[PDB]
Tab-separated table of C-alpha atoms in Angstrom:
chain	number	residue	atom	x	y	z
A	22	UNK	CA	170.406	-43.886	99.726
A	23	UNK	CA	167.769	-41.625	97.580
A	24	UNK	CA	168.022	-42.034	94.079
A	25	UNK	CA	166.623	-38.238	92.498
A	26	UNK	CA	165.635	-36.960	89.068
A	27	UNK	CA	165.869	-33.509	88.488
A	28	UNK	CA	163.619	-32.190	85.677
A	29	UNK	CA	163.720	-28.255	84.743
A	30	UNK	CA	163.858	-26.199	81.683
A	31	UNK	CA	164.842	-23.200	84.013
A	32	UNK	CA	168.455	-22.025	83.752
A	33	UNK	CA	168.306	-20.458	87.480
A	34	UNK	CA	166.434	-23.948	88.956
A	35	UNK	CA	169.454	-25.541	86.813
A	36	UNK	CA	172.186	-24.265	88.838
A	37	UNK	CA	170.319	-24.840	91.824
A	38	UNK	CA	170.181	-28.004	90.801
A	39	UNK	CA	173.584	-28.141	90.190
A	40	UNK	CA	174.402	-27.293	93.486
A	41	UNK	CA	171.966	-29.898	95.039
A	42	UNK	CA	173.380	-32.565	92.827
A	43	UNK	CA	176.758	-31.634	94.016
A	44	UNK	CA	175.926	-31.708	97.784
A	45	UNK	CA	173.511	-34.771	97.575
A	46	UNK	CA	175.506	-37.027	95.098
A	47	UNK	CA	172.941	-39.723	93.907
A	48	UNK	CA	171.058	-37.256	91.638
A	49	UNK	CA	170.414	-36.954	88.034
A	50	UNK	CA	169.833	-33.382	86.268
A	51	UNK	CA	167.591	-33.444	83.296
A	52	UNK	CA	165.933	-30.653	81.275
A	53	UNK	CA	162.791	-31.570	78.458
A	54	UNK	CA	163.038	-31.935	74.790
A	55	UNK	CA	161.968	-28.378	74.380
A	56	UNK	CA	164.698	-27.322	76.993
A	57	UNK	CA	167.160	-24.761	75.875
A	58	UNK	CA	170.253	-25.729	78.160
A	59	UNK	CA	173.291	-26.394	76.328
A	60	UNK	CA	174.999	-28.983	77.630
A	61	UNK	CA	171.750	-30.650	79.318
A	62	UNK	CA	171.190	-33.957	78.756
A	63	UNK	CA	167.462	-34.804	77.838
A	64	UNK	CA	164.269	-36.030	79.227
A	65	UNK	CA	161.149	-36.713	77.634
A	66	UNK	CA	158.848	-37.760	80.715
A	67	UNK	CA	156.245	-39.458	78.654
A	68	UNK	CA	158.240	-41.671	76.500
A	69	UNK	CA	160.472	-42.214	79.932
A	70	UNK	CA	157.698	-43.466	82.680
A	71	UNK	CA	158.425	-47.205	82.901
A	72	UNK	CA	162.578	-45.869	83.051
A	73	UNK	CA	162.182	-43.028	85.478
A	74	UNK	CA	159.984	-45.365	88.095
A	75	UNK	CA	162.441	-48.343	87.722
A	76	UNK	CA	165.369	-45.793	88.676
A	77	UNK	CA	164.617	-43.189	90.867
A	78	UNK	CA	163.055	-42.886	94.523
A	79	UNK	CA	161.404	-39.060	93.622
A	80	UNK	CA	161.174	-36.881	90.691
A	81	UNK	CA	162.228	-33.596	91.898
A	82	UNK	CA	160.586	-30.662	88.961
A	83	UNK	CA	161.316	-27.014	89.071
A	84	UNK	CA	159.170	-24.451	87.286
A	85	UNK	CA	157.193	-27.847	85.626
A	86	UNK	CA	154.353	-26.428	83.050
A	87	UNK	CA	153.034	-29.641	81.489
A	88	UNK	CA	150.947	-32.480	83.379
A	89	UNK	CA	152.669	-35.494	84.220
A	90	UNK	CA	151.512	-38.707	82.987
A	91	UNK	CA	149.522	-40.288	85.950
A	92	UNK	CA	151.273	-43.701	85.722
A	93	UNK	CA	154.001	-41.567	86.535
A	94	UNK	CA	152.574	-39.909	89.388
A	95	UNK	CA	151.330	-42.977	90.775
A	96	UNK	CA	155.297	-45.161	89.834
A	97	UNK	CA	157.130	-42.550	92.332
A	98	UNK	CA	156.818	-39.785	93.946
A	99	UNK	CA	156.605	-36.587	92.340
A	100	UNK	CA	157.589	-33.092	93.665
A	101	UNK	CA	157.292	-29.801	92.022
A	102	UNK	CA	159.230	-26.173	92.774
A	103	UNK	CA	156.922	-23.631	91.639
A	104	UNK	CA	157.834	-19.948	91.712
A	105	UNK	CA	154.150	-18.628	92.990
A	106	UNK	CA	152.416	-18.662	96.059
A	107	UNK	CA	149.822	-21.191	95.614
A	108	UNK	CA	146.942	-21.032	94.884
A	109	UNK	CA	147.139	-18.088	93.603
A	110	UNK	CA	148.371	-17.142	90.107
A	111	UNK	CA	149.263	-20.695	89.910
A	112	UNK	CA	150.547	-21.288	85.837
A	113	UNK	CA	152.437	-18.448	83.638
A	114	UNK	CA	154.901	-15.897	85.251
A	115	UNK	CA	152.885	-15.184	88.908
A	116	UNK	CA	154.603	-12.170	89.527
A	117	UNK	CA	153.544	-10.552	86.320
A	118	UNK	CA	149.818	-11.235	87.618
A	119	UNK	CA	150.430	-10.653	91.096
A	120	UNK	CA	152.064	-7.005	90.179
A	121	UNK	CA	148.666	-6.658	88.460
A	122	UNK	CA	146.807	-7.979	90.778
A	123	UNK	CA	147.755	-7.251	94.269
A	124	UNK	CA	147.512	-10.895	95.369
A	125	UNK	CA	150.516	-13.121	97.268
A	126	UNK	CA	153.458	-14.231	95.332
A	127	UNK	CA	156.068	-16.051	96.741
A	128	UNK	CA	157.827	-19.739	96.263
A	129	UNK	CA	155.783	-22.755	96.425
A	130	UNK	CA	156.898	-26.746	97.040
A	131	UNK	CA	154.113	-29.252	96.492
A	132	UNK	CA	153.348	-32.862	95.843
A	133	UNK	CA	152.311	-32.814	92.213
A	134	UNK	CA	148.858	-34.247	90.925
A	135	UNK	CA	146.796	-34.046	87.708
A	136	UNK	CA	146.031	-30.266	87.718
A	137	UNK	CA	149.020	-27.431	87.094
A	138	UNK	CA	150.579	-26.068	90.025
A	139	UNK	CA	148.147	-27.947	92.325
A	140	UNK	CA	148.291	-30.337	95.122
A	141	UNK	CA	149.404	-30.765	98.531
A	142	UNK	CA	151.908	-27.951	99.961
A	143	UNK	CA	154.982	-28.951	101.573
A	144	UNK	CA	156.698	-25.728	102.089
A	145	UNK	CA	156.230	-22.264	100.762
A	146	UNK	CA	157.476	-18.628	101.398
A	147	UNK	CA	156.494	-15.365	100.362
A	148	UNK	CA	157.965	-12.155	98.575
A	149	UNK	CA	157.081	-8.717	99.145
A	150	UNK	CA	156.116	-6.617	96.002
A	151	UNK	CA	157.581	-2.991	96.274
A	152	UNK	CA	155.618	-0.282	94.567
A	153	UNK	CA	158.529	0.271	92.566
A	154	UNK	CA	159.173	-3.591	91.593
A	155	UNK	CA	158.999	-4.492	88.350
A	156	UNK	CA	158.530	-7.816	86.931
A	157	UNK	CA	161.947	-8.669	86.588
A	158	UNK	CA	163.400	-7.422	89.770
A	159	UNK	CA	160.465	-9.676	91.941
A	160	UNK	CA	161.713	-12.625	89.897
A	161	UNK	CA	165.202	-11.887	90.933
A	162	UNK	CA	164.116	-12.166	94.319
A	163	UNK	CA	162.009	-15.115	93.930
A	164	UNK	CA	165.334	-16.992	92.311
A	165	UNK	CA	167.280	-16.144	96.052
A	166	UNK	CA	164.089	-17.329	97.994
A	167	UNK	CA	163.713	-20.300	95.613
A	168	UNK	CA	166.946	-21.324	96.551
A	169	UNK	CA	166.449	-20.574	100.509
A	170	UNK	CA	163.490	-22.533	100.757
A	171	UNK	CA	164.923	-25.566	99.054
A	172	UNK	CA	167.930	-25.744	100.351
A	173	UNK	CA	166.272	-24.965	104.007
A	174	UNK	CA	163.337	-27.981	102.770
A	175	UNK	CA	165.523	-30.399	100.949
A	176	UNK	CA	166.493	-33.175	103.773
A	177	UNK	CA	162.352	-33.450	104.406
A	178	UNK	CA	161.958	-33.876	100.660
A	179	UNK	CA	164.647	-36.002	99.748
A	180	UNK	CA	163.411	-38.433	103.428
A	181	UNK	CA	159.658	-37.816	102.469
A	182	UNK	CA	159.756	-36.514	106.169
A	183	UNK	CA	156.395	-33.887	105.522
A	184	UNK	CA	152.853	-33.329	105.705
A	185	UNK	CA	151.513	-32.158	103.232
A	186	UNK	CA	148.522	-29.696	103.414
A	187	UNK	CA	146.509	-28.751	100.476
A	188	UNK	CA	145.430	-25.534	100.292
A	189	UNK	CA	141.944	-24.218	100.981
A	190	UNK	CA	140.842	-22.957	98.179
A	191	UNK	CA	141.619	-23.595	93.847
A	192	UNK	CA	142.522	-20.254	93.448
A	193	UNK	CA	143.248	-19.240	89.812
A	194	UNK	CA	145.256	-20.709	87.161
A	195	UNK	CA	146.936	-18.501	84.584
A	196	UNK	CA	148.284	-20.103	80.807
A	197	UNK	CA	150.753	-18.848	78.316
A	198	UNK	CA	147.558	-17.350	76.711
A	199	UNK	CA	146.686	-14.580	79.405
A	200	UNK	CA	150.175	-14.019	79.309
A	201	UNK	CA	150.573	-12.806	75.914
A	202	UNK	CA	146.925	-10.975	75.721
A	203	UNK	CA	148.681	-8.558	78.897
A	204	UNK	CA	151.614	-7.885	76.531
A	205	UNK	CA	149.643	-5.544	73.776
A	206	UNK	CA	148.313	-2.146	75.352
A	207	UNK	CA	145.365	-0.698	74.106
A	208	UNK	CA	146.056	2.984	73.979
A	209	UNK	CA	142.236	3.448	74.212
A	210	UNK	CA	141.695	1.784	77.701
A	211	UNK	CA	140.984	3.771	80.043
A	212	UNK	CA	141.721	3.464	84.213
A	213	UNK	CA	144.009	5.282	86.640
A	214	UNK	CA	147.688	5.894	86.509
A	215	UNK	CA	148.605	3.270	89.065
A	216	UNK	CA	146.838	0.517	86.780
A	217	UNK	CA	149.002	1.877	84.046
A	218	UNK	CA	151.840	1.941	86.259
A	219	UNK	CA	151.174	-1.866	87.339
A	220	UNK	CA	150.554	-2.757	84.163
A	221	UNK	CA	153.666	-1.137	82.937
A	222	UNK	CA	156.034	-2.630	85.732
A	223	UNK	CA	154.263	-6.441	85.278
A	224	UNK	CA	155.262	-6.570	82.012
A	225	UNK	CA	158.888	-4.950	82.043
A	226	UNK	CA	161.699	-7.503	83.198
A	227	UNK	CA	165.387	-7.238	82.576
A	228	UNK	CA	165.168	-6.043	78.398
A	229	UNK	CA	162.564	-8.158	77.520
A	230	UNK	CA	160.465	-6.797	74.897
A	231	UNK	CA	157.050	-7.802	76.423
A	232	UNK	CA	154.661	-4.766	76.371
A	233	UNK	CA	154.126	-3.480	72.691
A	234	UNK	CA	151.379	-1.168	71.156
A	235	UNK	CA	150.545	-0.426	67.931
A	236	UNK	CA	151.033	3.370	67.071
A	237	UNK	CA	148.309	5.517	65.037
A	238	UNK	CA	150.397	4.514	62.159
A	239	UNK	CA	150.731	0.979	62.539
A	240	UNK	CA	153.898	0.611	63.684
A	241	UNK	CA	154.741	-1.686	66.586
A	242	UNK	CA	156.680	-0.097	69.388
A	243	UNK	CA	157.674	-1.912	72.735
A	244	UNK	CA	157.291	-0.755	76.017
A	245	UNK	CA	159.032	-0.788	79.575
A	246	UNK	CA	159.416	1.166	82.443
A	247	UNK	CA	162.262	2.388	85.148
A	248	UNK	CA	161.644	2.643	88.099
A	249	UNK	CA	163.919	4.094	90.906
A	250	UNK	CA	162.589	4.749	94.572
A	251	UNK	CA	164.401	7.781	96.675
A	252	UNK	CA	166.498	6.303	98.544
A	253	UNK	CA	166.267	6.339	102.422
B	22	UNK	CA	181.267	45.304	60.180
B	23	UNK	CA	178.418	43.712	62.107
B	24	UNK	CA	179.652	42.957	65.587
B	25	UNK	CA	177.358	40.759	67.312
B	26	UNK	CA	176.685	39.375	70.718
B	27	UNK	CA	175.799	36.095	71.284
B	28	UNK	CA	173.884	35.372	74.689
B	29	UNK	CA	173.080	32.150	76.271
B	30	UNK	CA	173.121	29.411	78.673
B	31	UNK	CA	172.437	26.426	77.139
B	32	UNK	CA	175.119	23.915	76.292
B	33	UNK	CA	174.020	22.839	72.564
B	34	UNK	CA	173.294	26.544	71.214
B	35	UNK	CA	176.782	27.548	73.195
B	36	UNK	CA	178.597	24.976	70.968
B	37	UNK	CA	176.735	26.067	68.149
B	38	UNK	CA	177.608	29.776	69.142
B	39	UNK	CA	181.568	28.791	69.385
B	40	UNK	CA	181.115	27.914	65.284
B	41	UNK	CA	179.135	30.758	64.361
B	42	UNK	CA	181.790	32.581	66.152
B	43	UNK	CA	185.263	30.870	64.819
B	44	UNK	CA	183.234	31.500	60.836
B	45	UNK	CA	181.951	35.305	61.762
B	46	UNK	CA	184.923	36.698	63.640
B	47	UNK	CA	183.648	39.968	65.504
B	48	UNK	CA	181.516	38.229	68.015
B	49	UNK	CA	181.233	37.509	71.457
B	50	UNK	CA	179.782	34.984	73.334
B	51	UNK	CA	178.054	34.980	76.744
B	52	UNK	CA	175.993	33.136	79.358
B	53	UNK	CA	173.675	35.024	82.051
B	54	UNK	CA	174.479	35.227	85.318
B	55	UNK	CA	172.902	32.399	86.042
B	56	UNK	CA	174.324	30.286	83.750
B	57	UNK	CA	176.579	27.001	84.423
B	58	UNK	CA	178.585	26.826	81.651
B	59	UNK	CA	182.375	26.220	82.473
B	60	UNK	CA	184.889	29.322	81.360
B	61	UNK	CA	181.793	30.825	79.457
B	62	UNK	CA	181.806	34.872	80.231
B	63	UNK	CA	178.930	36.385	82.016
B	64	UNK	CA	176.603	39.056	80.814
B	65	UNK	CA	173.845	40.900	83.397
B	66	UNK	CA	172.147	41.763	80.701
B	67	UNK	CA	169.654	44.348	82.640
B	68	UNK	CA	172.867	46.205	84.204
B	69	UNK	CA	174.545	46.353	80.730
B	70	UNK	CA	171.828	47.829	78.030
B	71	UNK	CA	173.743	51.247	77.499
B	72	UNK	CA	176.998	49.586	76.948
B	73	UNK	CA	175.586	46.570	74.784
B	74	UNK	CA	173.932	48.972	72.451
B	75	UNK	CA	177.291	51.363	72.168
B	76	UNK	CA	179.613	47.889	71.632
B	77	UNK	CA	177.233	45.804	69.155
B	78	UNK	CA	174.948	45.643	65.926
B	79	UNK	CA	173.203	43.077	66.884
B	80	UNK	CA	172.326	40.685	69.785
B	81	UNK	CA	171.628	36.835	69.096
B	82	UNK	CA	170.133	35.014	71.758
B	83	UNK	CA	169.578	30.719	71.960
B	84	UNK	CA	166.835	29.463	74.045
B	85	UNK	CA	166.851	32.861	76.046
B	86	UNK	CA	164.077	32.480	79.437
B	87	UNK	CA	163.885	35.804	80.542
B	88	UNK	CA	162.694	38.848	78.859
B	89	UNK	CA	164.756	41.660	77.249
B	90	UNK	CA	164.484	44.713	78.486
B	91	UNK	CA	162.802	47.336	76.716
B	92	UNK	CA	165.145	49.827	75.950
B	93	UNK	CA	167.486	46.798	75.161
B	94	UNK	CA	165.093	46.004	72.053
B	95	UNK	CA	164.788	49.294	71.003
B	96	UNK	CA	168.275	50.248	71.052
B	97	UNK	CA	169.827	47.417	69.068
B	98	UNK	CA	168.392	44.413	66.889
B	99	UNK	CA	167.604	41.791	69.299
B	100	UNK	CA	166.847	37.992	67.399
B	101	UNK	CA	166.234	34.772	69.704
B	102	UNK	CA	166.814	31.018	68.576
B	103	UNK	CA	164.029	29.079	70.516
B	104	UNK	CA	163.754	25.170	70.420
B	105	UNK	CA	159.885	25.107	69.587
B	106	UNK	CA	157.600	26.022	66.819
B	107	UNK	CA	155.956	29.277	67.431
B	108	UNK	CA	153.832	29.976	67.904
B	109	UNK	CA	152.941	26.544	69.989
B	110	UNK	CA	154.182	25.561	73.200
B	111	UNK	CA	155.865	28.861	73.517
B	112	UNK	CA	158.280	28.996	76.786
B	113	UNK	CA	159.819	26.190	78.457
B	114	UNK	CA	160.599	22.886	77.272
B	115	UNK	CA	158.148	22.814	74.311
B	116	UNK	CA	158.728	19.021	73.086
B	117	UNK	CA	157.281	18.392	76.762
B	118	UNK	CA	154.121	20.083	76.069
B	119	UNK	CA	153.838	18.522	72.505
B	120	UNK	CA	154.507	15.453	73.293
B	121	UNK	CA	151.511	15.793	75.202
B	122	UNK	CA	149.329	18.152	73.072
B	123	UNK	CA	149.764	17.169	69.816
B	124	UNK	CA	151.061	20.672	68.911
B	125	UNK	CA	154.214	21.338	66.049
B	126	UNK	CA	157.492	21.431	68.057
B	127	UNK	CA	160.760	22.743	66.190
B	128	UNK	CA	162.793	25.704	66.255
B	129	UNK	CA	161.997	28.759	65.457
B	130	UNK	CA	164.581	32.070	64.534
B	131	UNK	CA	162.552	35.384	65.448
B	132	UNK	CA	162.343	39.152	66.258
B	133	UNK	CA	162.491	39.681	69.876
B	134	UNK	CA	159.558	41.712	71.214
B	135	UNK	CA	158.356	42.307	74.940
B	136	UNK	CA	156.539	38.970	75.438
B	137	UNK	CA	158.203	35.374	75.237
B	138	UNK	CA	158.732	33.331	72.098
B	139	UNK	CA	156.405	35.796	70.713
B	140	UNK	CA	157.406	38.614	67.862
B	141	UNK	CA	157.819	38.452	64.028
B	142	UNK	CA	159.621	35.054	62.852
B	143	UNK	CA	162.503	35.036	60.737
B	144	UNK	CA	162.507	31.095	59.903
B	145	UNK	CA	161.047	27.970	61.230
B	146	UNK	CA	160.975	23.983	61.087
B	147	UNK	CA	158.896	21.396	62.320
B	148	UNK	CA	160.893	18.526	63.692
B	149	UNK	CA	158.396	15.207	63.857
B	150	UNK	CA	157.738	13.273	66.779
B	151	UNK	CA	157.541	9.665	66.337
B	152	UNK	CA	155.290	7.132	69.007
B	153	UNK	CA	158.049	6.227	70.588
B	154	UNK	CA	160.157	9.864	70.970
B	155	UNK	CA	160.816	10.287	74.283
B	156	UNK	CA	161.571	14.449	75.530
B	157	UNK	CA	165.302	13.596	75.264
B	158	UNK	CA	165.276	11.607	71.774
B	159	UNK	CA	163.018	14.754	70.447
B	160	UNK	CA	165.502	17.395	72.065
B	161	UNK	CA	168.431	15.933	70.145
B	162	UNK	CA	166.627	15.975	67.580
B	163	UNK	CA	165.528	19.868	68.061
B	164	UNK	CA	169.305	20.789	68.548
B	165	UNK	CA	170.289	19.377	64.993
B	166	UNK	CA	167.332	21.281	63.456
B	167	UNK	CA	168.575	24.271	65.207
B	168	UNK	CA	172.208	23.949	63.864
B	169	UNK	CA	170.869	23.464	60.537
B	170	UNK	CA	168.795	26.267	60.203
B	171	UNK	CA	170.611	28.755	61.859
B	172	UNK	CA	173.336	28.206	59.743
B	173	UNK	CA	171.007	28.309	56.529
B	174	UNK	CA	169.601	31.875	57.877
B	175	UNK	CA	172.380	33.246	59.162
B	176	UNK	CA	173.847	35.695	56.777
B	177	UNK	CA	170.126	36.787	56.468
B	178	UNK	CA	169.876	37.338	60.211
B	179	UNK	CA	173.612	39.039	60.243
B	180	UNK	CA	172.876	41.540	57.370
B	181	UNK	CA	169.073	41.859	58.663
B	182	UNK	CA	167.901	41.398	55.128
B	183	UNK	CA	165.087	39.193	55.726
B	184	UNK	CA	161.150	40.091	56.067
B	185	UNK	CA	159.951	38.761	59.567
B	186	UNK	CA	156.015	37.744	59.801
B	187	UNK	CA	153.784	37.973	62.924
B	188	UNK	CA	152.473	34.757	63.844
B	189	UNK	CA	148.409	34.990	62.678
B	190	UNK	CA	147.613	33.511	66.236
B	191	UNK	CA	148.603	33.508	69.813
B	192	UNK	CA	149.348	30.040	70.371
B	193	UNK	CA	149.990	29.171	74.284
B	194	UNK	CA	152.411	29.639	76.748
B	195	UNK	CA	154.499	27.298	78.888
B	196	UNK	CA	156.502	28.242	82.017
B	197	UNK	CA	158.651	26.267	84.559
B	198	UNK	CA	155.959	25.889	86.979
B	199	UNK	CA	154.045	24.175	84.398
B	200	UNK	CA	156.651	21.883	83.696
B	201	UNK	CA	156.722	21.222	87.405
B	202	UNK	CA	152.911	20.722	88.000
B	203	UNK	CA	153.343	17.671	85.158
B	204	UNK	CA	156.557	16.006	87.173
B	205	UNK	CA	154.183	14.645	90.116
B	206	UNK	CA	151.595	11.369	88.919
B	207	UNK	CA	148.852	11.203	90.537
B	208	UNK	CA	148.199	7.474	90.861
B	209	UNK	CA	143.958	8.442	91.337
B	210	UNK	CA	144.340	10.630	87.940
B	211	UNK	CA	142.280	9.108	85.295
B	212	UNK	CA	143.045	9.019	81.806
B	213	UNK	CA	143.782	6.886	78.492
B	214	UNK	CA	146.648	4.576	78.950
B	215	UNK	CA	148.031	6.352	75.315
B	216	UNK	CA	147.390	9.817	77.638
B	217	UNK	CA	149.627	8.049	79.801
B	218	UNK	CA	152.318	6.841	77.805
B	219	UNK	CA	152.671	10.315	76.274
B	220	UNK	CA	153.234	11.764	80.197
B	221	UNK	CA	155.519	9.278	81.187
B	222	UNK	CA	157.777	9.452	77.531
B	223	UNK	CA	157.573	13.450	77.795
B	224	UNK	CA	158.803	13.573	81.362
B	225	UNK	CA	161.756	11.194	79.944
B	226	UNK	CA	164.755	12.612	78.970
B	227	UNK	CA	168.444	10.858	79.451
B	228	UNK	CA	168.475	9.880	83.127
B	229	UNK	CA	166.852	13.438	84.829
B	230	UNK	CA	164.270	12.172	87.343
B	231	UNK	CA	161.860	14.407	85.832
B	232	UNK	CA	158.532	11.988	86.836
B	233	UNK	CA	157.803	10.735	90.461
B	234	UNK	CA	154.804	9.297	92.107
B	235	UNK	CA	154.795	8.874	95.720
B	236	UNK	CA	153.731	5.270	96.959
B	237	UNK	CA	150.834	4.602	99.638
B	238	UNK	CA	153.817	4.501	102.367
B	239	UNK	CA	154.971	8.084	101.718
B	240	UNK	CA	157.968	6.432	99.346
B	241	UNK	CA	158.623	8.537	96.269
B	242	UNK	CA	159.392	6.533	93.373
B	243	UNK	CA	160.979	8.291	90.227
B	244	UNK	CA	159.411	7.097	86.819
B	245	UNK	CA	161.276	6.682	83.245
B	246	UNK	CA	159.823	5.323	80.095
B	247	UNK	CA	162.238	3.123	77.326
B	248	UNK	CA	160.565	2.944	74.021
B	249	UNK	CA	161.897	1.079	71.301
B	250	UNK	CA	159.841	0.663	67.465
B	251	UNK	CA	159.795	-2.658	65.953
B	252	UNK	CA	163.196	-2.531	63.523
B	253	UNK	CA	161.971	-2.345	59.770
B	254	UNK	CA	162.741	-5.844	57.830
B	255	UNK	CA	166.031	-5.512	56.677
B	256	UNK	CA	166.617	-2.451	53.688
């Protein structure tokens, strides 16, 4: 007897939510206009708000990155999937900054409010970094734990059955901006090999052709690293 | 009329070797006895300097490690074939070291005398090294250049009718511990993070674990580098 929207743009949050939909029944599955799902059908929140609050009991978001509108907020209520450990490196790819910068990283379920990645907790988990992690092979693990802690969490969302708990402190917040600045190494900077390591491993997932430099002939030439621990 | 033996125990200059032979005729072709190539024939080449000298006019070695023995040298014309430009990075590996240094690597064709990669050079070529070489994409590289010029020289180097030249300098000299001090990272080592890029891409080659680190746990974690330039706009 709960009606759901499902918003993501994320193809692994889209089969979850696939799955959900199939379990739970009374569910719709939406991506944004920006979305890149084929086969998705098409959401755009703003133009929607009167629509979605008539409808639906609880907007369900994974992996949101643009404020809702607050009539929206206030018309139902609104729950986000976020794949950091909030507060911090809430925003932009947390494992990236996480590798970087040794803080938690993990899966995070919250009530959603005016601010990105912000608001009262309802459930989250952590993930271990390995030294030899990479960002990729974290966010593989964060998709399984994503999954575990939804599924595990989903009756208490889908009932509103929680408390919520905001968490102590704001943290930090990083955009698609800090992002993209990590991608280009300087060859001039100077710090240990680990930092170069971290930085290295932050910015190498799957074959993505994040890390670049520009070589002492001005050539562009992308960077990533393997790494293999001994096994055991 | 020249009868020439080939020695050595690397895998592209064997190849090479099995062409030179197959074009030349009276030649043979050996590895050391430490060698591990398949079905290749085994020459101790200390134990077997009266009866190399009797059997052959001249002795061709590719990428040879250890040092000829004296009477070896002076009983028959010894030439080596070694995979750097001499006379920098001398010894092992020298892309390694240049990736590193800076220095010319290539190959270089030259007299054999009692010190390594050392001696009066026949013929040599640089082979460049791009940002993004890695050891391995250099090596290939190296072996082409090798084919190529050792086929351009080798009449010359058969008949002995070139004029060798002393390198005017010393250069430097790399050997296998050397190599192996450079496989361990030091996470507290300070440096540039170009410094760095040019340790991890010249401790890449093909899948060897060449580069490790060991994590604050005691874990050792093996280390690779995958460069790739931007492609040109299309031709």
């Amino acid at each position: 007897m709960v009606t759901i929207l499902i918003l993501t743009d994320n193809v692994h949050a889209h089969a979850l939510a696939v799955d959900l939909q199939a379990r739970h029944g009374d569910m719709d599955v939406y991506q944004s206009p920006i979305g890149q799902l084929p086969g998705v059908p098409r959401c755009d929140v703003a133009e929607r708000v009167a629509e979605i609050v008539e409808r639906y009991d609880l907007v369900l978001s994974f992996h949101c990155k643009q404020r809702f509108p607050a009539a929206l907020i206030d018309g139902v209520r609104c729950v986000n999937v976020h794949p950091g450990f909030n507060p911090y490196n809430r925003g932009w790819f947390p494992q990236v900054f996480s590798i970087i910068d040794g803080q938690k990283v993990g899966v995070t379920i919250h009530e959603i409010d005016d601010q990105l990645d912000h608001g009262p907790i309802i459930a989250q988990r952590e993930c271990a970094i390995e030294s030899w992690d990479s960002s990729g092979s974290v966010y593989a693990r964060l998709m399984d734990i994503e999954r575990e802690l939804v599924l595990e969490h989903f009756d208490a969302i889908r009932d509103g059955s929680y408390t919520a708990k905001s968490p102590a402190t704001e943290g930090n917040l990083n955009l698609k901006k800090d992002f993209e600045q990590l991608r280009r190494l300087d060859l001039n900077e100077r710090g240990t090999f680990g930092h170069f390591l971290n930085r290295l491993r932050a910015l190498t997932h799957d074959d993505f052709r994040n890390a670049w430099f520009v070589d002492a002939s001005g050539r562009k030439v992308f960077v990533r690293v393997v790494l293999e621990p001994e096994k055991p």
